[PDB]
CSV table of C-alpha atoms and ligand atoms in Angstrom, one decimal:
chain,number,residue,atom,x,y,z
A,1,UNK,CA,40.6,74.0,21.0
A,2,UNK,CA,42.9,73.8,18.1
A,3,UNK,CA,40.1,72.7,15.8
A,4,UNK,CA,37.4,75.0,16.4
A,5,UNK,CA,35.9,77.1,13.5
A,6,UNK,CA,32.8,79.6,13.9
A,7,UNK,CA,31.6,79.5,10.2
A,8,UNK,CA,29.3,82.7,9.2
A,9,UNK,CA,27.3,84.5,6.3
A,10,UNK,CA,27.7,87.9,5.4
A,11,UNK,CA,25.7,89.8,3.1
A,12,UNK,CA,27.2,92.5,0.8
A,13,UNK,CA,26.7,94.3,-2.6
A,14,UNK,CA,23.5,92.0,-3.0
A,15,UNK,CA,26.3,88.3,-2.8
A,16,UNK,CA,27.0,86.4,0.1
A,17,UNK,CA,30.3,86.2,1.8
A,18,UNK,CA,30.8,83.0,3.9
A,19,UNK,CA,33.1,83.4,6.5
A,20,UNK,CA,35.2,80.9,8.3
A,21,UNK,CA,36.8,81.7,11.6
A,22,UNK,CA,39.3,79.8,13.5
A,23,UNK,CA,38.0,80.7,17.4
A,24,UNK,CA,41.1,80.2,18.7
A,25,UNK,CA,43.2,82.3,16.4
A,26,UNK,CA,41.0,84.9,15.2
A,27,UNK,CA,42.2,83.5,11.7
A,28,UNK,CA,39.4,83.7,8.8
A,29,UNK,CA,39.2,82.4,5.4
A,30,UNK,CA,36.4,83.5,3.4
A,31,UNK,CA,35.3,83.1,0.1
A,32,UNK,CA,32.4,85.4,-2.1
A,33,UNK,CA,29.6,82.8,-3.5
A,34,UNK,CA,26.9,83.8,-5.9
A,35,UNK,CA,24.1,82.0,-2.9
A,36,UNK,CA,24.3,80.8,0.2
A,37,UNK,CA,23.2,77.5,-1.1
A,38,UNK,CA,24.3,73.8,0.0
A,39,UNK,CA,26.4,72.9,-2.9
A,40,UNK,CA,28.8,76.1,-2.0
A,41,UNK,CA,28.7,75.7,1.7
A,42,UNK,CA,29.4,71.7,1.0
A,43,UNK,CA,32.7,73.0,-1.6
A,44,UNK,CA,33.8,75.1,1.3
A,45,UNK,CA,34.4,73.1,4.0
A,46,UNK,CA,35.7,70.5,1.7
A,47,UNK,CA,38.7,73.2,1.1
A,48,UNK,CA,38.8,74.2,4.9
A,49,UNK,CA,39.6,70.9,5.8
A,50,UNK,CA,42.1,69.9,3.3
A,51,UNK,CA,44.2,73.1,4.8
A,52,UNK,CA,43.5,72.5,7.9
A,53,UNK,CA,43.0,70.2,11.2
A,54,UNK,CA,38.7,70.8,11.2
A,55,UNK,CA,37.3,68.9,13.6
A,56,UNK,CA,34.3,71.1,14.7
A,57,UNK,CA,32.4,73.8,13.3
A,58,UNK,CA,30.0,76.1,14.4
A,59,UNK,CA,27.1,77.4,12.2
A,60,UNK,CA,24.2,79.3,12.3
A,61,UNK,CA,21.3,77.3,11.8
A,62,UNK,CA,20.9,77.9,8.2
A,63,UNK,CA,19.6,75.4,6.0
A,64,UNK,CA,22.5,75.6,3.4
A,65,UNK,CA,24.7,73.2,6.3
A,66,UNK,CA,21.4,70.7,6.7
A,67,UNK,CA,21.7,69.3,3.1
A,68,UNK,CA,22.6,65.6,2.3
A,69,UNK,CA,25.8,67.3,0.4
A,70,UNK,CA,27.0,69.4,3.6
A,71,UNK,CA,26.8,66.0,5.8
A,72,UNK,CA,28.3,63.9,3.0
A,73,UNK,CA,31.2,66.2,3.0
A,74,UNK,CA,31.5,66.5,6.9
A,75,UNK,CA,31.1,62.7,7.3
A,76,UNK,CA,34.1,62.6,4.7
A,77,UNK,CA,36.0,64.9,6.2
A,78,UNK,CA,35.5,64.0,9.9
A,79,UNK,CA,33.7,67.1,10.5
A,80,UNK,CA,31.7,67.7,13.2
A,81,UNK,CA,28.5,70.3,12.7
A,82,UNK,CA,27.3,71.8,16.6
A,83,UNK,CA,30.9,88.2,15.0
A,84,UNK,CA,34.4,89.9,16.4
A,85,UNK,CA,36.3,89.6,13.8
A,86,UNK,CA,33.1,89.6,11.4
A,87,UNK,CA,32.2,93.3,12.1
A,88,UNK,CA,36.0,94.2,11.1
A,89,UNK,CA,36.1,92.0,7.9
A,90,UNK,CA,33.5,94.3,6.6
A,91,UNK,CA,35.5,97.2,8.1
A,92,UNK,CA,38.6,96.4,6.1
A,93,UNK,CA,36.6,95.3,3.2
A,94,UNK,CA,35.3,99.1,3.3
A,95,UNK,CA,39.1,100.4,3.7
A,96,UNK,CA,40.6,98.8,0.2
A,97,UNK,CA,37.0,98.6,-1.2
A,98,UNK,CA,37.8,101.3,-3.8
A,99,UNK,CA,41.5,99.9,-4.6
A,100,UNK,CA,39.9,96.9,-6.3
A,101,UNK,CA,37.0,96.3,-9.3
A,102,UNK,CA,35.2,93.4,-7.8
A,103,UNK,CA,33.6,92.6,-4.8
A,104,UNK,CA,35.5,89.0,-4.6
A,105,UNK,CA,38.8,90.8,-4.8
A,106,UNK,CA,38.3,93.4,-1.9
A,107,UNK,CA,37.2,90.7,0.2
A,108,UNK,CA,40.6,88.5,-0.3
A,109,UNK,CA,42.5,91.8,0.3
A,110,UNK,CA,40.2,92.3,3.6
A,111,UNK,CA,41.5,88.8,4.6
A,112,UNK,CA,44.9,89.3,3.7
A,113,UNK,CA,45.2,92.2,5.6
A,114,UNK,CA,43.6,91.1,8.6
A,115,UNK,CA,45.6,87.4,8.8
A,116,UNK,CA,49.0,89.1,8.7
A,117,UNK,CA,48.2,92.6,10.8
A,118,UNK,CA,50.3,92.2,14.0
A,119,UNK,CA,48.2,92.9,17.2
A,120,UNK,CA,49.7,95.2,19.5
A,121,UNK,CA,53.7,96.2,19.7
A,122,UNK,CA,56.6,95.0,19.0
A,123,UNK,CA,56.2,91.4,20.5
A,124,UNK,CA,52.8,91.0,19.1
A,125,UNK,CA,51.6,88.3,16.4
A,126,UNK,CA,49.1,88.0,13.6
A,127,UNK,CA,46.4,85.5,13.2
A,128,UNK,CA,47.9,83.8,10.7
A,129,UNK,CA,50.9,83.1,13.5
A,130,UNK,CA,49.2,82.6,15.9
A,131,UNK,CA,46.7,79.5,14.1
A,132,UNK,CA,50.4,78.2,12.9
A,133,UNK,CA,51.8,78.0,16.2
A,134,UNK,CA,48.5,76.4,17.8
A,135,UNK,CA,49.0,73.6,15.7
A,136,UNK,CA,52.5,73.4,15.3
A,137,UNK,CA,52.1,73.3,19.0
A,138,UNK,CA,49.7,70.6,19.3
A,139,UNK,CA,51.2,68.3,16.7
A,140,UNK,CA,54.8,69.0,19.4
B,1,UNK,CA,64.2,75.2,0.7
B,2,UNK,CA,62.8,78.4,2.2
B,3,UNK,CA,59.7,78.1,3.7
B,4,UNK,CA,58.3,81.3,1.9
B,5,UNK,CA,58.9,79.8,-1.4
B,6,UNK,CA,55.6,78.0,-3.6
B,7,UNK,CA,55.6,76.3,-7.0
B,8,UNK,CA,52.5,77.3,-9.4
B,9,UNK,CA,51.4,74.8,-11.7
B,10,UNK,CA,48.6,73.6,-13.9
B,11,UNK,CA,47.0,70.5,-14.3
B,12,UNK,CA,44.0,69.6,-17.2
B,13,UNK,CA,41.1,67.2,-16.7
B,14,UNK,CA,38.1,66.3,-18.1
B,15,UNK,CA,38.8,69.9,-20.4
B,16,UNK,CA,39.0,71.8,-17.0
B,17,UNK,CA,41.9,73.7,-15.5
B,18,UNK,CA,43.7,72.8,-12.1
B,19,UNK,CA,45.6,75.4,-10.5
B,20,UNK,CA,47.8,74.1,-8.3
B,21,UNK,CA,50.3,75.5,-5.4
B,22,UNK,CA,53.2,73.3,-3.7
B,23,UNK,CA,54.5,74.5,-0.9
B,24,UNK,CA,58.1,73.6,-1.8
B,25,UNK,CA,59.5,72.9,1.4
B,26,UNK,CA,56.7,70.3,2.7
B,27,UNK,CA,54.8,69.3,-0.3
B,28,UNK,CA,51.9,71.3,0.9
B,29,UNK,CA,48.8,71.8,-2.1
B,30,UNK,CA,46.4,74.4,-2.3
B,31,UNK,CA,44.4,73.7,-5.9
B,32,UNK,CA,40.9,75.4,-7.6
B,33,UNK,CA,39.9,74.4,-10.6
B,34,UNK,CA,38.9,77.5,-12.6
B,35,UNK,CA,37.1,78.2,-15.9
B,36,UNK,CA,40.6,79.1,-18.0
B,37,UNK,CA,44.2,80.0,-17.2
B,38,UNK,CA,43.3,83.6,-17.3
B,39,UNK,CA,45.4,86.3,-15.9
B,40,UNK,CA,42.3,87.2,-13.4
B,41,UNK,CA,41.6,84.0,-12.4
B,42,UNK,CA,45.4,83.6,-11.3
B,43,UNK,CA,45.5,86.9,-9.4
B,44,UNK,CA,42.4,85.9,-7.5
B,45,UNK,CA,44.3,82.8,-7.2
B,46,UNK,CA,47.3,83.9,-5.6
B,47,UNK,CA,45.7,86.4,-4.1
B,48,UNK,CA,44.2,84.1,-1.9
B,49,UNK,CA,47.0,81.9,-1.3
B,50,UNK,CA,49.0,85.2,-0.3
B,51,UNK,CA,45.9,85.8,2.8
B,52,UNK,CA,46.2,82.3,4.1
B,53,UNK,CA,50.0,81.7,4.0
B,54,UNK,CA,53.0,83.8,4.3
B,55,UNK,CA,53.9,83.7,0.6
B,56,UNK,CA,57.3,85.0,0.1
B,57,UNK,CA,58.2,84.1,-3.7
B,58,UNK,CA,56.5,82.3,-6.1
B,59,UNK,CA,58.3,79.7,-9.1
B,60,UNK,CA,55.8,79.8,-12.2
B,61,UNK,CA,56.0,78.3,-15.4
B,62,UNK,CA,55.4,82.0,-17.3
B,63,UNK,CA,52.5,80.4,-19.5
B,64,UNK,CA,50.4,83.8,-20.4
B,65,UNK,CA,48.5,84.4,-17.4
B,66,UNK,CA,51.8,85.1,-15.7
B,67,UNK,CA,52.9,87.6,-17.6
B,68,UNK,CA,49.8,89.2,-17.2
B,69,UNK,CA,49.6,93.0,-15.9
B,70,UNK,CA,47.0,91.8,-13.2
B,71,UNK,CA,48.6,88.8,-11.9
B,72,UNK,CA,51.9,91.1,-11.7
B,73,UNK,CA,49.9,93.8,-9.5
B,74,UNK,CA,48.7,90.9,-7.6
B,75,UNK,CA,51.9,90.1,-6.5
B,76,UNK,CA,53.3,93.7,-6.2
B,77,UNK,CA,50.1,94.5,-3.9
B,78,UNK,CA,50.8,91.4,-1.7
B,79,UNK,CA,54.6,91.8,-1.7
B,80,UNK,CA,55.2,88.2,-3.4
B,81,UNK,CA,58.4,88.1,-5.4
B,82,UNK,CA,57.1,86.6,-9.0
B,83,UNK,CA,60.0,84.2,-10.1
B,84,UNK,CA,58.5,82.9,-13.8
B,85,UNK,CA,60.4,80.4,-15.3
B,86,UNK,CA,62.2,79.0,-12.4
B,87,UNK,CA,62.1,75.0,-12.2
B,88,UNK,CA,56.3,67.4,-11.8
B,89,UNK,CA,55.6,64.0,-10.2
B,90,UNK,CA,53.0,66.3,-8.2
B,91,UNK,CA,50.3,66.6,-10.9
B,92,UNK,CA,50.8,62.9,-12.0
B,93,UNK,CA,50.1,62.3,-8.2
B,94,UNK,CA,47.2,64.3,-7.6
B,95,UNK,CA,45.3,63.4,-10.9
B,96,UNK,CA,46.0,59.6,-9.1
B,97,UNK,CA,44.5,60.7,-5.6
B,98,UNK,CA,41.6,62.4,-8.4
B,99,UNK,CA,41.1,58.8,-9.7
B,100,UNK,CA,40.8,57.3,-6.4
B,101,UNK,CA,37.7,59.1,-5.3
B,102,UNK,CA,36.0,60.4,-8.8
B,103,UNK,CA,33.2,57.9,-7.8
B,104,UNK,CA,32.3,59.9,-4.7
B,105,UNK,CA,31.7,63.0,-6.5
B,106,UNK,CA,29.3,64.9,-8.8
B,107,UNK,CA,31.9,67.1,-9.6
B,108,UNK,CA,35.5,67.0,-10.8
B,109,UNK,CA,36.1,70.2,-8.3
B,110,UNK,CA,34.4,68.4,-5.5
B,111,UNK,CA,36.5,65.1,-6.3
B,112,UNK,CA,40.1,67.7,-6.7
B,113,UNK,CA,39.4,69.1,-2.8
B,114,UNK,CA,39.2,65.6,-1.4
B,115,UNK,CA,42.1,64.5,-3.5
B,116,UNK,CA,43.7,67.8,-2.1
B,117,UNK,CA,42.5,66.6,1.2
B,118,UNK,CA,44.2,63.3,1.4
B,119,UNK,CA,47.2,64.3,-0.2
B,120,UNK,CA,47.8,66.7,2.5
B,121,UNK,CA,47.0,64.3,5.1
B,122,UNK,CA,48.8,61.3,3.9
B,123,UNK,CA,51.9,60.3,6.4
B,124,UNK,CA,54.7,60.0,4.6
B,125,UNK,CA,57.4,58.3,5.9
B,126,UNK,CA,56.0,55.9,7.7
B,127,UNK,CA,53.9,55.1,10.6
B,128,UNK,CA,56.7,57.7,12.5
B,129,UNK,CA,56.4,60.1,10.2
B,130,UNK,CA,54.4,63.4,9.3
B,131,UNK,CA,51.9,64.5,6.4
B,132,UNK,CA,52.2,67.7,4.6
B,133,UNK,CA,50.0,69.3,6.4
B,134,UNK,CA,52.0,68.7,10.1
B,135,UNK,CA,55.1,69.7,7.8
B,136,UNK,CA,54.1,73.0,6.6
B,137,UNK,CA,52.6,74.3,9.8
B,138,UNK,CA,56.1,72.7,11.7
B,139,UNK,CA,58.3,74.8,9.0
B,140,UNK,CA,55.9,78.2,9.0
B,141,UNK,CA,56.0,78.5,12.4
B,142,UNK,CA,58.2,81.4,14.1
B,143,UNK,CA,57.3,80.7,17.7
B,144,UNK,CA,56.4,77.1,19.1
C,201,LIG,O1,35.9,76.2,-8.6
C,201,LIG,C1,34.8,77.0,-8.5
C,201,LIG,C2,34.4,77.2,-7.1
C,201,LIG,O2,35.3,78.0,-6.4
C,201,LIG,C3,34.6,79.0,-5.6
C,201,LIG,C4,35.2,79.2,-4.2
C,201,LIG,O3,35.0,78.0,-3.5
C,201,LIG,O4,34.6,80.2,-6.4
C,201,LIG,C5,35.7,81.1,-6.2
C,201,LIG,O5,36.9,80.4,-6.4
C,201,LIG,C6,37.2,80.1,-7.8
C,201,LIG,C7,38.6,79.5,-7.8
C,201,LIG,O6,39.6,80.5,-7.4
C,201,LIG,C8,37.1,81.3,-8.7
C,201,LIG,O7,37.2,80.9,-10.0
C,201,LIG,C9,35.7,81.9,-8.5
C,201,LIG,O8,35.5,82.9,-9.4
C,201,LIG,C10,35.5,82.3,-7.1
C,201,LIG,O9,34.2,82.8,-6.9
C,201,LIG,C11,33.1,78.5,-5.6
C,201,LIG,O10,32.2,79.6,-5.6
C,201,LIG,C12,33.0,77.7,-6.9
C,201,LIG,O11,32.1,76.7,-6.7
């Protein structure tokens, strides 16, 4: 499961968030777009899968990831097309919402904060661990 | 060689503006292109980077949007030491990659993510050896 992503939409001060989550992690990326249109969905998975090992992802059936440019850029990229952290990304976005002017700046705090948060005690790990040992792992 | 430790640079194209990041210790890239070096755009920038990697310090070449009061509360907020100043065959490699697959793009950003793409992917050293991309995830790691 190493290369497993749920991608998602969010909708928020009248823009669109999209969402990437990596299932096995609980690691997101996101990134604030003026529309959820093709071109923008197309751009970021292109990014997703330069940082990382995509091999599947998992959309709603929207019509932004049916577009000749989304399957271009999946084809290129070897991607394959087939809400538990998305509830608390708009949490968090709520938390630091006031520390920041923009909407686009909250959002990358929100995603900061929730890829290096340790879960539970001492002996825990973050999302952004626990997606770098998963593939550290799997590469051995 | 610490594996917290990126290198900022710039590249220009076509009259746009590449910002990229190396991870120093693997030769990792992260790159936008963006509208103008503006002290905005490279908060939102690093800001970024910061969420997705554990981003310890970062080497910058102090142009203007450095020294900028809202890339330096960028970095205070996500606890990155700013090192400006601190010290190439990178950006003449990537705007290579760029040329490579130009032809398959629309768009110079859309051509600079694939570039990105197969730089990170490309085994170096090889058949045996690793890409960027197996290298920074194999130096990041604190528990395999
Ligand atoms: O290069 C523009 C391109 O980047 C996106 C994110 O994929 O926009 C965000 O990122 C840019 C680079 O950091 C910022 O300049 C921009 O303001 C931010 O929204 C796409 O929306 C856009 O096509």
């Amino acid at each position: 499961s190493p290369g497993i992503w749920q991608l998602d939409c969010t909708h928020l001060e009248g823009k669109v968030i999209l969402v990437a989550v990596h299932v096995a992690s609980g690691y997101i990326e996101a990134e604030v777009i003026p529309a959820e249109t093709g071109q923008e969905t197309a751009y970021f998975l292109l990014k997703l899968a330069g940082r990382w090992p995509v091999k599947t992802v998992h959309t709603d059936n929207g019509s932004n990831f049916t577009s000749t440019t989304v399957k271009a850029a999946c084809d290129w990229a070897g991607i394959k097309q087939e809400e538990s952290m998305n509830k608390e990304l708009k949490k968090i976005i709520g938390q630091v919402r006031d520390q920041a002017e923009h909407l686009k700046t909250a959002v990358q705090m929100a995603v900061f904060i929730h890829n290096h948060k340790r879960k539970g005690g001492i002996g825990g790990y973050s999302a952004g661990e626990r997606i770098v040992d998963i593939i550290a792992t799997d590469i051995q």
